[PDB]
Symmetry: D2
Subunit: 93 residues, 4 copies
């Protein structure tokens, strides 16, 4: 339990913790609501995928299921939706 | 449209794009499903909150509303949920 | 701790639990990865917002900050991105 | 473009849209920020998983990979994190 005076700021300290390079995620939440979220590593649905340094999507092993349309959505530091493109992945034969 | 031969890998290019520092988020999605996600800036519910470099949470100005229980949850590089604590923020009168 | 034979299925039972109408969310996770997620109530950034039964966004009290561009993205049961529109909210005066 | 007088409420209409049952998700976003979100079908990482009507998790076919610790976390209608348990899924040999 932590006390803090109104109007002024407070830092909720994380108990027995030491921020190391091993740490990938730290998620602060008040109830079900996500308050603050930190994550070092990019999100990948499965191991089949891999996001590149230039934003490109790399599907490691193609499969009939891997077809369908994909959507790229890029946002700037400001947060504006800079880009919004669609790609139709089709399997050759 | 992008043609990929089954079984082999493939990279979906971002149509006319250059990864710059002003680029915070890259979101790849196959339909509603989230496939790939990149994001520099951490997630903060509002400017009232701020995630620190040591994982700590910083609420800017207190509010009677800002009271309640918060949940810190850390995750290792491999995905293990090391640490899952709760804090009871009470405003001092 | 729970045991289950390979090849066949298993139900991970939730301890001392009783699913009632009070329950809004149930999130299953293996490590940091979100496995299964249930949520009864729609997501709203703050109390200022409210999503309608027809999908429309209702901003309760307009504010200079409430300006900027908004994006509507609708998906079908199948999961395809049915609609993807943009709206420019401007304040009158 | 949509004009709203400051202080008063406003509803952002979904351009030519009709809420049907085949509509699973409605995602409103101001920039990168998620403002409103609607979704019928629960989130499941893959068809291998299935969320039950009582909150239980059902893994279809076991796999050595499917082993490890899972985390059930329930949340009340108001947002309180009632219950946060862990289960150790071990495949029986």
């Amino acid at each position: 339990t932590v006390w803090g005076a109104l109007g002024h700021g407070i830092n909720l300290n994380i108990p027995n913790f030491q921020m190391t390079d091993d740490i990938d995620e730290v998620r602060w939440e008040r109830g079900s609501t996500l308050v603050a979220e930190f994550k070092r590593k990019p999100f990948l649905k499965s191991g089949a995928f891999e996001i590149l340094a230039n934003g490109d999507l790399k599907i490691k092993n193609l499969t009939r299921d891997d077809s369908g349309t994909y959507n790229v959505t890029v946002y700037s530091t400001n947060g504006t939706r800079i880009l919004d493109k669609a790609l139709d992945l089709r399997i050759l034969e």
